[PDB]
Amino acid sequence: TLTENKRKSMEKLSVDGVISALAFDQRGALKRMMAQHQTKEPTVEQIEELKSLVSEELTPFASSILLDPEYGLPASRVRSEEAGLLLAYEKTGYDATTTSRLPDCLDVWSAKRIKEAGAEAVKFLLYYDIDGDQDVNEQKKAYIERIGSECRAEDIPFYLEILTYDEKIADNASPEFAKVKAHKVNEAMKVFSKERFGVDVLKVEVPVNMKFVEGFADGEVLFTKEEAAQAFRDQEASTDLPYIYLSAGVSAKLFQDTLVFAAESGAKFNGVLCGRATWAGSVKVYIEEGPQAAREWLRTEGFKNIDELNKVLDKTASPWTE
Amino acid sequence: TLTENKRKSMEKLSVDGVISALAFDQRGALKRMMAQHQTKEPTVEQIEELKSLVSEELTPFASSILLDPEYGLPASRVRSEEAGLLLAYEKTGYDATTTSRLPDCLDVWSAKRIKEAGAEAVKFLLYYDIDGDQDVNEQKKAYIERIGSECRAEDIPFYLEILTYDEKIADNASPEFAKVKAHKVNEAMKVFSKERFGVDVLKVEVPVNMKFVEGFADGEVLFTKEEAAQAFRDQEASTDLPYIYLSAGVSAKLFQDTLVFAAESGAKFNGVLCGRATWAGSVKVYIEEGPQAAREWLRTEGFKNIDELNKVLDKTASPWTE
Ligand SMILES: [Ca+2]
Ligand SMILES: [Ca+2]
Ligand SMILES: [Ca+2]
Ligand SMILES: [Ca+2]
Ligand SMILES: [Ca+2]
């Protein structure tokens, strides 16, 4: 049950119980995208500006925006007044030399400081392999307990993002991983739905790799529609917390088709925290043609993209408000 | 100020508003004492036993005991029913290679787990140099905010221990450091007394190296008694929080003399988190004549030691109930 302040914050992040949030806390990933289109290293000024442009042009069409404290603070101050704010709390990436992918908060940040920076939610990404090293997972669970406790104290919603993996499978897009994905996703949600983690909303993957599902696949078919549908019902049965989907490994259209398939299957998901697909194309335009050009792209292609997603969400998502 | 549960825990940690706590969360430092008679590397059993012996024999005469989650959990279960329990949350020691001495919680622990382990307080040691790198201190302040937040959420008193140092002064006991100690201690207390850090009790050094104070000094004299007394008054005015003294670099007798002097100077300290000198003479006896001998040393010399300290506290310490 939400405290008064957490409920107020949840309300600021959604519309009629549905979270239609724009994810733009990309840091290293965004810089790498930018570097594709110019010779000089992308600058802090360029990065901050592009985030500000996306925030200004697209938040009128989003219930909230997720930004990073590193480059995203100016962008947060120019968001639509109707849109709420989440700030990321985790350091990006993971050590490729090991399989542990341990969580680490930004060095000079705390839940209190995230709140003071005007956020209505603390977001934190955790990599989790339910079948992995038990001592590694013990450390991960302890770390999430601390964060959930911070958020309880600061009275600010805790959005926990879970990205699954397997210590022994290098490629999550592989058929090998696809066969175990539902297990990884749904069992991880079951663990992190425990009261002791203090989570208010789970940001999670769809529990199936739709590219291998009958009727969605163009190549090999690993699952029938009924099998895929059962993975969604299992996911729904894994938690009683609000949860929202992130998009990965799929085209904007497939993600939208997945949202429809999810709702048809019985998943009562409560929205999305989705980004790249919507503003991606503006990065090239910003680098090559400049800010005003980027605005124009966002006002046209950007809007068209977010609009189509919104219409789908509007007919697929269920409200977290019971 | 204190919530109902924090106050109840605070009361379990003290007697008549005075904290006479036995500090015994030493880890590496204790097995190293056990160097006498190097019949192999000290056993985890031995370490857990000595801690249990000390706990069972001495806690009847202390208001609480501080243990480490590493070796001290068995010890904590055999503590007198009249003594409260603090558990250490920080990893011991620091990197000698660098000057940052960054804090770091025990990997598989959280304030929640500490509370679940039966503790009436979370204790955390932070090394702080008020004059050191500004970014390092930013990271340290953020870290303490997080812990302070955890403890608020779990509704458990937060005991912050501050050990001061200087990035550019190797020896803590040097005359050079002595000349700035009061500055380091008192200014750090001012910082961590701010509401945002959520500290309930400060465990701090006396703000002067008494080994250089007129009348207390065996060798050269750096300060008069009036200069020392003022440092104590400055310390009293650096915080409105309850604070207790740790004993460092001095004999049991000198520590006790310092308590008297502190009180005479106008310091309203609320007890101590000490006792290493009360059980110090049993470490050798334990690996010399076995468990039985140690118990006898504790029931005799041990008791005398802690009883003697208690009598000084009765004449010097002020109740935190203020
Ligand atoms: Ca609208
Ligand atoms: Ca308006
Ligand atoms: Ca539950
Ligand atoms: Ca459910
Ligand atoms: Ca007493």
From Swiss-Prot, chains A, B:
One of its GO terms (biological process) is D-tagatose 6-phosphate catabolic process. Its EC number is 4.1.2.40. Keywords: Lactose metabolism, Lyase. GO terms for molecular function: 6-deoxy-6-sulfofructose-1-phosphate aldolase activity; tagatose-6-phosphate kinase activity; tagatose-bisphosphate aldolase activity. Pfam families: DeoC (PF01791). It catalyses: D-tagatofuranose 1,6-bisphosphate = D-glyceraldehyde 3-phosphate + dihydroxyacetone phosphate. The keyword Lyase applies. It comes from the Bacteria. Pathway: Carbohydrate metabolism; D-tagatose 6-phosphate degradation; D-glyceraldehyde 3-phosphate and glycerone phosphate from D-tagatose 6-phosphate: step 2/2. Belongs to the aldolase LacD family. This is Tagatose 1,6-diphosphate aldolase 2. It comes from Streptococcus pyogenes serotype M1. The gene is lacD2.
